Design a protein around this nucleic acid. Structure first.
Lengths: 113, 118, 214, 54, 122
RNA sequence: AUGGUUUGGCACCUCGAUGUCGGCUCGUCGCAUCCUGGGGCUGGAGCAGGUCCCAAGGGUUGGGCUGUUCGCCCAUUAAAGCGGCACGCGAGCUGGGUUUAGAACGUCGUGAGACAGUUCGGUCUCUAUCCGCCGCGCGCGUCAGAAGCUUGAGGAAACCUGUCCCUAGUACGAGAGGACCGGGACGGACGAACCUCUGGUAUACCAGUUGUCCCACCAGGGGCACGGCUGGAUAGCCACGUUCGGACAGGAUAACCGCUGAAAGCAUCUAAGCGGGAAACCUCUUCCAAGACCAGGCUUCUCACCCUCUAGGAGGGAUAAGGCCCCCCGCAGACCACGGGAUUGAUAGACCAGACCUGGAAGCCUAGUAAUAGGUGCAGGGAACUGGCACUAACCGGCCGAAAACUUAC
């Protein structure tokens, strides 16, 4: 029954779209740039998802200007205003760590048809 | 089930797995065996979970049991009598009785047997 | 003056503040406490208040403790502890039978949590005292973790009481200071304390107002 | 390291006195009618007749 | 986490290709340098036509790291390689162009010129 | 004039054995103080220094060359202190140097050989008796037997520091430059607690796969090959992770600044006095602590029943409160101990459900010549975490364990 659940559920966040590792999403993250608000979109591949309830975190990896970038976000973080799932990937693993060594043609992911 | 907190029983993990499998086979084939108390203590959850698999008798569960028992006559008995016998009992299929110590090394012996009350 | 309460460490979780920062918070079951005895200078020589916490079946208490609780006038509780105050005016607001709950603390308050640290067993110097071990190669012979030198060359020819070597570790009362109470859940009687408090989950802790930042 | 000196009788006897065996506690049992002493650890086994009793 | 005798790729166009860290400035006996820390480094590899030369002792700031670095809001950022940008005493790049993304940590450390020149700030 | 920290001199000390330099690990002490702290004069305008007093609480970096100590150099830093303790520390480690036997070079000797000249190579033994130190128990004591909560004499731990922003570009200063005091934020090193996050581990978890043997055979699996090898991996332990700490305040003070004034009609911070004055001292923070023999205090519980020798005391037995042993266990643990439960029970296991990990089970059907792919299906499998559930085991049970009296005062 996960004793801390009654504390957890108060801060739990609904409306989170369902997604799995391998899907391609763009995360709308609000940032601070000289005390003004703007949303910076991070589009990449979800390579892992470590379930913990409120402490559930997912990682998104993107290739930008020839340098790989990985960002880990708490799923229920208020800093994430909205998550949009673009494509559904076809993978055989729960964590895609093997993608850290692949570039371009070899790093593509099958699409669930 | 829960792995042993300390070092393994037979001196290695593979020997411990083989030891547990053989002890479970002997217990199912005879109905009660006598062994050192820690061996029966570790054997209880293993045999009880095998009996739980045998209770819900399907081909999948039969394969699950056979991947640990390796003895086909014992598997047949387990899925023919031992399984249906404990149909309406929820847990506690076995019991442990502590008996007199061994003479050679003063090891604490214990007898583990299946319950036949109901 | 310095408020206090007996509680239980439930676990640790995560919360987000109003700046969207993450706050690792420890959940403390600051349940109902009942004052059982009052220590006064005129009778005991010092001023303190005694609190009772926990629930146990009445057949589990021995006759002396049950008699003490009956003389106090309340049902027996599992845990009994004393809060050392400073003077009689501090103890004037507590009377026997009064029930203390979590809402004595407020959001943003600074507290001191006291508990028994986790047990680590017979721990060597590398773990107990942070000793740096010797080299793991270059010919070092069976000294990869031993402390090395102890004393020196005769003179005192002894070992100078207080020398740090291996021994039992943990299981000691530990106080963590200036912990900020992030939220006081009154309806569960639960304190959300930012940080880590000593002890295992389900252990007994004492939450007191901070002595430095309060 | 080797002992530098021969241990005196007093120290030897005092430390030797700690090597001893404790008497196990016995409780009675009724098997086949006759009453006899059995350790409480083996009470259930004796009641089910799993312990050889001379 | 960059320390002594560690090698970093150069993310600017001063002609240097690879530098070796010498010291981590910002306190005595300091151990590691994350995103936004200034290090003293020597150039190990340089472009033949570049203005810098091998063995030159320079001052650089780390802009990318392989070890993930926690942020205030509970999120993390991890890059693919360790990268540094050569700067002068006034915290401006000695180059005029920055290659690859950088971290947000360069903003709170008052590296405004590098942030503006960077192709993208994450 | 001090010191025995340098080379010396003597040889009292050991040749029926006292390891010879550096390095590592671990210290402790002195102040003749490197930084931080407090002041004085400045040939001190401010900045920054020069120099001299008080001050030992803390700190005092990583590398290149050399066996090195030493030393030079490269980056920093608040600073990269000097010394004592067998020039600390080899029953703690190393053998790079020196200091056996092999061999070579230069020089000396006719020769065997030699050189506080050079170079390559060259066994570092031991089950801890006593003191000492770190932890843990047993016994007894504390004037009946016990049980809760504590006071604390006394002791230990900790004590570091930087940059930036306001005051303020003011005081001072031809200008440059450049503040005192007080507030705030962010750091470096160190220490502790903890496992929400990140990361490491994972020998009864999940999946893939190679060689081989076996389950009669296909299918599905199993043993071995480092858990065979890989991809993940909840709990526990942990750091590279999270949080927190160094305080504030008071007292007496050092150098010093002083007030009030004698001896000595003035003067004099002084011989009477009274004050300020530091990271040092006593408190203050955390921890241990009544074996503190002055063996403490506040309470609560049982608060009684025989037999014997001779009635003086003693001995024995059975008891009460309570404790222990046996039993079920723990994130408590070498053993012991500690903590929880013991049928009036959720202590452990099993069972059911959830969380989480893995990633789509077997069988059947469909498509494909086949490898294989899709559906049945967030499937199947499973440890630690959570909640229910007496099904199994905590048992028709043993051992200990309660009062001489007297004096004085009231």
């Amino acid at each position: 029954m996960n004793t801390l659940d009654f504390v957890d559920q108060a801060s739990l966040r609904d409306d989170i779209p369902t997604f799995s590792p391998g899907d391609t999403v763009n995360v709308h993250v609000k940032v601070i740039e000289g005390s003004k608000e703007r949303i910076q979109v991070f589009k990449g591949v979800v390579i892992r998802r470590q379930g913990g309830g409120i402490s559930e975190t997912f990682t998104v990896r993107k290739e930008s200007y020839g340098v790989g970038v990985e960002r880990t976000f708490p799923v229920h973080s208020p800093n994430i205003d909205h998550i949009d799932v673009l494509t559904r990937g076809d993978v055989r693993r729960a964590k895609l760590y093997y993608l850290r060594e692949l570039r371009g043609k070899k790093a593509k992911i099958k699409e669930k048809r | 089930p829960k792995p042993t907190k300390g070092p393994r029983l037979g001196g290695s993990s593979s020997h411990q797995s083989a030891l547990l499998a053989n002890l479970a086979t002997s217990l199912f084939e005879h109905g009660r065996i006598k062994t050192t108390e820690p061996k029966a203590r570790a054997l209880r959850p293993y045999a009880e979970k095998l009996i739980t698999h045998a209770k819900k008798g399907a081909l999948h569960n039969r394969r699950e049991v056979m991947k640990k028992i390796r003895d086909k006559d014992v598997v047949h008995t387990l899925f023919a009598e031992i399984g249906p016998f404990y149909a309406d009992r929820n847990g506690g299929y076995t019991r442990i009785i502590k008996v007199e110590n061994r003479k050679g090394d003063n090891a604490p012996m214990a007898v583990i047997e299946l319950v036949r009350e109901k | 003056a310095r408020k206090g309460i007996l509680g239980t460490k439930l676990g640790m979780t995560q919360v987000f503040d109003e700046n969207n920062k993450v706050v690792p918070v420890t959940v403390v079951k600051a349940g109902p406490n009942v004052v059982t005895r009052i220590r006064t200078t005129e009778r005991d020589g010092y001023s303190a208040v005694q609190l009772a916490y926990g629930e146990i079946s009445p057949r589990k208490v021995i006759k002396p403790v049950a008699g003490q609780f009956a003389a106090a006038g309340v049902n027996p509780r599992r845990h009994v502890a004393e809060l050392r105050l400073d003077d009689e005016a501090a103890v004037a607001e507590y009377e026997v039978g009064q029930e203390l709950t979590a809402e004595i603390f407020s959001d943003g308050a600074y507290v001191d949590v006291t508990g028994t640290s986790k047990g680590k067993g017979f721990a060597g110097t590398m773990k107990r005292h942070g000793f740096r071990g010797q080299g793991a190669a270059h010919g070092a012979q069976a000294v990869h973790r031993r402390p090395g030198s102890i004393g020196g060359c005769a003179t005192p020819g002894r070992v100078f009481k207080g020398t740090r070597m291996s021994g039992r570790m943990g299981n000691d009362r530990v106080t963590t200071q200036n912990l900020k109470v992030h939220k006081v859940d009154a309806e569960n009687g639960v304190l959300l304390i930012k940080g880590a408090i000593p002890g295992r989950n389900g252990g007994l802790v004492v939450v007191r107002s901070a002595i430095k930042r309060g | 390291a080797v002992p530098k000196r021969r241990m005196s009788r007093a120290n030897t006897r005092s430390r030797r006195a700690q090597w001893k065996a404790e008497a196990p506690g016995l409780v009675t049992v009724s098997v086949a009618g006759q009453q006899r002493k059995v350790p409480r650890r083996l009470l259930k086994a004796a009641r089910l007749g799993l312990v050889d009793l001379d | 986490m960059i320390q002594q005798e560690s090698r970093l790729k150069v993310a600017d166009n001063t002609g240097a290709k690879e530098i070796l860290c010498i010291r981590v400035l910002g306190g005595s006996s300091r151990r590691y340098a994350g995103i936004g820390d200034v290090i003293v480094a020597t150039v190990k590899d340089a472009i033949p036509g570049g203005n810098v030369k091998r063995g030159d002792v320079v001052k650089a700031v780390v802009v990318r790291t392989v070890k993930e670095r926690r942020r205030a809001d509970g999120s993390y950022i991890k890059f693919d390689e360790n990268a540094a940008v050569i700067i002068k005493n006034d915290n401006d790049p000695r180059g005029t162009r920055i290659f690859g993304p950088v971290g947000r940590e360069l903003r709170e450390k008052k590296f405004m010129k590098i942030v503006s020149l960077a192709p993208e700030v994450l």
